[PDB]
């Protein structure tokens, strides 16, 4: 139980009851007011009783220490969260951060030595691409002194403090919660220069020397402060070293300093203003509208709410409101359009509010207990559109016919003859005579998709406790009685993989028969949701096992069946409407959904199935449960006798968000279409994330002004909005005018903010998240340095600067290595690696500049700056290393050490499941290994009938044997082996074991039950120590491969590397089909301006991409049907190839996949001739001609050797990084030539039609007929 480190990043909510409980048990005074005094009263009565355990004793001792130290300070005052935010953001100590300061000073003195060469190596790449001969003299200074910029920031000392405290408390928690030693020493204050710390295991006490203020914090608050400050430091550095954000820096700094000044005064309600910067960033983008009547429409509501919050809080004065409004005006008002979605990235950096259960239960009870008055005529007019959509969706795909479809009763003439003639009908007829669909009875014409996969059940979910024990979540401390013990399990996978008799039809009948309404164990509970900036905000609901299974089954049915029917001179002009769907699922009563659930009952043939949710909720009780907010109950009572009070919501009517999402989404389109018909406009809806948009569209004459076109296209939707609002209010829904936007230009979605063909992306959202330790279960430097480099590459595509992001990655990697070496809580870091590595400075930067596919710890190579996917990691990392050695960042001997390093020990299955892996010693991820071990164990030991007969303990040996048979030939093909093994029944098992997302609790349970041995525990408890030892050996080793030089191509280097790396499985046999030349080394460039003649063109090359851009002010505006797992057999048999004899083996494996004969297989496979842009703003102006680039190796009837899109992505990249700082595209039209040269990169190969299988084919004794495994009865 020691391979689990405490949490490093924030993942839970900040509950004020938690701090109140800790302090009230530690007997410390505190100025914390609670909405419900039930927790305090319970703890008080429990103390008067005499209950106490080890936690109470430890907290009492820490409280005694605190109360004894508080005597030296006469006027101490507890400053509660969030009132202490302005102080604790700028706290700084000089005698407590004495260690991390020296650590980071050394980490900065190393970068100060490598930075001149880093800049030289980036300037080489720039000049080679053809952007001049010298970087900007500003970029040079920033790249070189990037460490001094990061160190002379206002958040650096708070960062050091909140990292020291975080790691110290993490070490305390880790070394304490382990049951090895129990005798504990009391923790004493650490008197620093300006503050005094007490880092206990539960709470931290910070006293301020000069101010006398006192703060008490918990682990969640420490994690949140560390996260906030590590985000602010990274974003401020990334906006300081950058020039495009020169105007945004002042606005963001003023926003920080202005909203920090409200925390001491306003308090917790300050997040109701912090959470007003997402709507304001759109209300201030509407002020650039083209229909002046709309400017201010949303801003009026935003300012009204910002005034109401101040008034209710108490700041009734007008001066404060006026200064606040002027400040917000200055902050948000700007000129550049692409810098309007940036303030979106920063509204999560003020911290998260402290929330309780009462104030989040009342907010949902208010909406779920509320009468409504729907209107039958419009309800049926929407139901008519529903029936019409179903009619058309079945008449299509079936050649215009209604064989099992509707049977009207008194239908009109046209709508009765449409069925006879077998023709469809548009919205017009349905809304015109909706009386014809007033009694239509369908008939079952939709099969039940049953054994697709196990996604729904396997995906980790929580379960509520059985209704008979609903208060087992509350520990015995905070309760006024002894709660009943918890028998059942508390996870969907833990109750699913133990189901001795599971049946989806058993569940469907558990709903149909109607036993879910008499089940004496059903229970629904609410749980507060972490990392939200609204005190009420959202909760997530947990329900019992059988009901959750029926819910996921119903949703899968309604998403796989009719849910797919609803997917979809004069010019067209479209406006946009955007409204959020929060609090939009509580206005869904049974009356307004029965007419749509009934047609689906009659379509799927499931009597009274699809309306289970409301029939079950309307007679149940749902409480909001968190362990620290107990109910006020002197004795245990059933969930039916609790009154309607703080945490309970008795007998709701509305829905629950997430459940019946497809049902509500397909039942909400009929009213959009009715309101569109009633106005004569064509609409298109899109629910993306948490807010739905509607693109109302109308046809207008072409010879019209753009202004008048957009004005009329906005008028039509200003008319449509009121119609739609009336319709939704008649069916029962409130389409509020405050929380909604109408605009002729933009609409929000989940990839940024679309604005009139552009995309105002937010580039500083991932820089604020490239924090030190990555999300994992054990602190591992490899995963940390991979998450550090996987976010800079995302900021680069969202808009950041390539060179500055690369330098930021290098610096953060260099100091992450040092933090993991000499500032870690790990106990296996020994002086045989810590001391030599920390002492040798050159080696420590060599290991941080060496790429990861080679053996180093640098995961961002200079080709990932430009292209999205690099060709081959091993042949691109060697090109990167050659570039570094040339620019003199690393010595020449590093290449020889790389090429003669120590080969690891990996089998054939690992090479088949990772085909680009030049095998390395101790490189894999401990988290991934523990997942792939525990998932396999728990799937092998499971009596579940759904996956039985598939996970036998010999599956590992069978997988290794199949991989050996596939790979071992006279010519090795790892990519084809990977494809075959992935599509086979040995890849299906791994896909299921990956879908089975194991949690920290599940791995804890596995260790408790003995899932893995103590030998595996000791092998994976000291992994990173072996990473550092292997790196030391790699960089110290003094060998030489006389046949290695800097001039040999990177392709040849990677081939030699793989051959020498595993000749033990190759013995000289050629590995084939992996190496593809590096794009940045293979492609040179040149920029033709107004009057000049190309030079690298006339030097001889005739193969080059040609890009063009004109001059104009822009950058502001302008036997085989319904396929199944048989597809797996087909793609496998094509990946195998066309063989005279080995077609038998291909048929054998495809038969083990699916049941089919050799002749049908050969006639179904498509035998081939062989044997084997939404991110930038200057791509609109750009014109690309691929003619001259068409020259490839013989340009025969094959695929492009290099990925043809690379020579275009790398041209758009350079054009964007040229026009990155310009407002116009110049005065003269510019051209770009992108010559390529892959001469020595061509593999001299022998075209083998196919290789003879030099190993005997041994498979499973008999292909199991498990229907989840690829089907064995297609026809």
């Amino acid at each position: 139980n020691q391979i689990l480190y405490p949490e490093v990043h924030l993942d839970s909510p900040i509950v004020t009851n938690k701090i109140v409980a800790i302090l009230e048990y530690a007997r410390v005074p505190h100025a914390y007011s609670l909405e419900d005094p039930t927790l305090c009263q319970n703890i008080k009565h429990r103390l008067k009783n005499g209950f106490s355990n080890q936690m109470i004793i430890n907290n009492v001792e820490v409280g005694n220490v605190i109360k004894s130290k508080l005597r030296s300070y006469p006027a101490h005052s507890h400053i509660p969260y969030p009132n202490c935010n302005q102080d604790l953001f700028n706290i700084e100590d000089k005698e407590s951060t004495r260690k991390i300061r020296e650590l980071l000073k050394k980490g900065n003195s190393l970068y100060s030595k490598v930075s001149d060469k880093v800049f030289q190596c980036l300037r080489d790449t720039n000049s080679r691409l053809g952007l001049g001969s010298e970087l900007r003299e500003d970029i040079k200074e920033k790249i070189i002194n990037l460490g001094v910029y990061m160190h002379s920031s206002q958040w650096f000392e708070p960062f050091l403090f909140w990292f020291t405290v975080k790691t110290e408390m993490r070490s305390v928690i880790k070394s304490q919660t382990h049951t090895c030693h129990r005798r504990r020493h009391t923790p004493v204050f650490f008197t620093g220069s300006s503050v005094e710390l007490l880092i206990s295991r539960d709470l931290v006490a910070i006293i301020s020397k000069e101010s006398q203020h006192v703060y008490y914090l918990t682990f969640e608050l420490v994690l949140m402060y560390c996260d906030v400050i590590e985000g602010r430091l990274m974003t401020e550095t990334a906006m300081t070293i950058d020039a495009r954000y020169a105007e945004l820096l002042g606005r963001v700094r003023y926003m920080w300093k202005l909203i920090d000044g409200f925390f001491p005064a306003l308090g917790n309600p300050t997040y109701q203003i912090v959470a007003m910067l997402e709507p304001l960033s759109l209300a201030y983008l509407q002020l650039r509208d083209i229909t002046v009547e709309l400017r201010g429409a949303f801003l009026n509501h935003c300012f009204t709410e910002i005034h109401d919050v101040l008034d209710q809080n108490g700041f009734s004065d007008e001066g404060t409101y006026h200064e606040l409004i002027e400040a917000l005006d200055y902050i948000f008002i700007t000129d550049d359009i692409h810098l309007t979605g940036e303030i979106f990235s920063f509204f999560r950096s003020f911290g998260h509010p402290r929330l309780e259960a009462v104030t989040a239960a009342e907010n949902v009870r208010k909406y779920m207990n509320q009468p409504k008055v729907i209107v039958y005529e419009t309800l049926m007019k929407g139901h008519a559109i529903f029936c019409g959509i179903i009619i058309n969706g079945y008449r299509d795909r079936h050649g215009g016919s209604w064989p099992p479809l509707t049977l009207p009763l008194h239908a009109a003439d046209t709508i009765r003859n449409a069925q006879a003639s077998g023709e469809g009908l548009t919205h017009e007829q349905c809304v015109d005579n909706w009386k014809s669909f007033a009694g239509v009875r369908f008939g079952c014409f939709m099969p039940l998709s049953l054994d697709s996969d196990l996604t729904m059940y396997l995906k980790d979910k929580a379960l509520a406790a059985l209704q008979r024990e609903w208060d087992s979540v509350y520990p015995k401390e905070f309760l006024r009685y002894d709660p009943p013990k918890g028998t059942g399990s508390r996870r969907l996978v833990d109750v699913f993989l133990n189901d001795s008799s599971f049946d989806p039809y058993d569940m469907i009948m558990y709903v149909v028969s109607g036993a879910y309404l008499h089940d004496p164990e059903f229970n629904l509970s609410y749980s507060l949701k972490e990392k939200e900036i609204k005190e009420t905000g959202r909760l997530f609901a947990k329900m019992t096992y059988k009901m959750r299974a029926c819910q996921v089954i119903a949703e899968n049915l309604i998403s796989n069946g009719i849910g797919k029917y609803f997917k979809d001179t004069y010019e067209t002009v479209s406006a946009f409407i955007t409204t959020d769907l929060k609090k939009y699922c509580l206005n869904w009563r049974y009356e307004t959904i029965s007419l749509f659930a009934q047609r689906l009952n009659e379509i799927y043939g499931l009597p009274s199935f699809f309306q289970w949710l409301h029939k079950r909720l309307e007679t149940s009780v749902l409480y909001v449960s968190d362990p620290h907010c107990p109910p006020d109950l002197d004795a245990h009572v059933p969930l039916c006798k609790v009154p309607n009070d703080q945490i309970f919501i008795k007998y709701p009517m509305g829905g629950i968000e997430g459940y019946c999402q497809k049902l509500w989404t397909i039942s909400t389109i009929p009213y959009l279409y009715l309101a569109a018909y009633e106005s004569g406009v064509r609409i298109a809806s899109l629910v993306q994330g948490d807010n739905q948009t509607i693109a109302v569209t109308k046809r207008v004459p072409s010879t019209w002004p753009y202004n008048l076109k957009k004005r009329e296209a906005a008028r039509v939707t200003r008319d449509y909005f009121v119609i739609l609002r009336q319709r939704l209010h008649d069916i029962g829904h409130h389409l509020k005018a405050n929380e909604t936007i109408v605009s002729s230009h933009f609409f929000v979605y989940s990839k940024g903010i679309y604005y009139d063909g552009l995309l105002v992306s937010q580039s500083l959202k991932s820089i604020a998240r490239c924090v030190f330790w990555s999300e994992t279960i054990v602190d591992e430097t490899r995963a940390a340095c991979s998450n550090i480099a996987t976010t800079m590459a995302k900021s680069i595509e969202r808009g950041y600067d390539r060179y500055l992001a690369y330098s930021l990655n290098v610096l953060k990697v260099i100091q992450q290595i040092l933090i993991s070496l000499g500032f870690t809580i790990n106990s296996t870091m020994t002086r045989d690696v810590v001391i030599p590595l920390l002492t040798n400075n050159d080696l420590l930067i060599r290991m941080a500049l060496l790429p990861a596919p080679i053996g180093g710890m640098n995961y961002l190579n200079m080709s990932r700056l430009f292209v999205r996917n690099i060709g081959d990691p091993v042949t691109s990392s060697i090109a990167d290393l050659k570039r570094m050695i040339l620019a003199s960042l690393m010595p020449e001997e590093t290449l020889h050490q790389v090429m003669t390093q120590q080969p690891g020990d990996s089998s054939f299955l690992d090479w088949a499941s990772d085909p680009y892996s030049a095998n390395l010693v101790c490189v894999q991820s401990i988290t991934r290994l523990l997942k792939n071990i525990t998932a396999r164990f728990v799937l092998i030991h499971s009596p579940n009938p759904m996956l039985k007969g598939l996970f036998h303990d010999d599956s590992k040996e069978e997988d290794e044997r199949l991989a050996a048979f596939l790979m071992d030939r006279h010519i090795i093909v790892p990519r084809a082996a990977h494809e075959i093994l992935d599509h086979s029944v040995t890849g299906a098992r791994e896909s299921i074991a990956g879908m089975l997302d194991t949690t920290k609790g599940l791995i804890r349970a596995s260790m408790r039950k003995g899932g893995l041995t103590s030998r595996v525990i000791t092998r994976l408890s000291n992994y990173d120590y072996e990473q550092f030892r292997a790196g030391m050996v790699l960089l110290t080793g003094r060998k030489r491969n006389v046949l290695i030089d800097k001039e040999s191509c990177s392709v040849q280097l990677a081939r030699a590397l793989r051959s020498h790396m595993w000749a033990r499985l190759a013995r000289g046999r050629p590995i084939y089909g992996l190496e593809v030349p590096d794009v940045l080394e293979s492609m040179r460039g040149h920029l033709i301006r107004r009057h000049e003649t190309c030079v690298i063109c006339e030097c001889g090359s005739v193969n080059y991409g040609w890009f063009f851009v004109p001059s104009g002010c822009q950058l502001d505006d302008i036997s085989r049907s319904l396929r199944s797992a048989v597809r797996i057999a087909t793609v496998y048999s094509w990946a195998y190839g066309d063989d005279d004899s080995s077609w038998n083996e291909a048929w054998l494996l495809a038969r083990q996949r699916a049941n089919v004969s050799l002749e049908e297989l050969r006639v179904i496979t498509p035998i081939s001739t062989s044997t084997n842009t939404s991110l930038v703003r200057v791509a609109r102006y750009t014109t690309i001609s691929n003619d001259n680039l068409s020259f490839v190796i013989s340009d025969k009837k094959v695929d492009t050797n290099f990925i043809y899109q690379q020579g275009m992505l790398l041209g758009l990249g350079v054009l964007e990084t040229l026009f990155r700082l310009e407002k116009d595209t110049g005065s003269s039209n510019t051209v770009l030539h992108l010559h390529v040269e892959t001469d020595c990169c061509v593999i001299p190969m022998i075209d083998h039609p196919r290789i003879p299988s030099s190993r005997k084919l041994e498979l499973r004794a008999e292909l199991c007929t498990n229907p989840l495994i690829y089907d064995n009865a297609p026809l």
Binding site: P371, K372, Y376, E377, Y590, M653
Partner: peptide
């Protein structure tokens, strides 16, 4: 019959537009 036809059709005319009142509590 000549009068009963309209006397019964007015019933459908009035019933084709009604208001459904949904309560606030599922049990009451």
């Amino acid at each position: 019959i000549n009068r009963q036809n309209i006397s019964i059709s007015t019933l459908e005319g009035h019933l084709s537009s009604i208001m459904i009142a949904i309560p606030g509590l599922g049990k009451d």
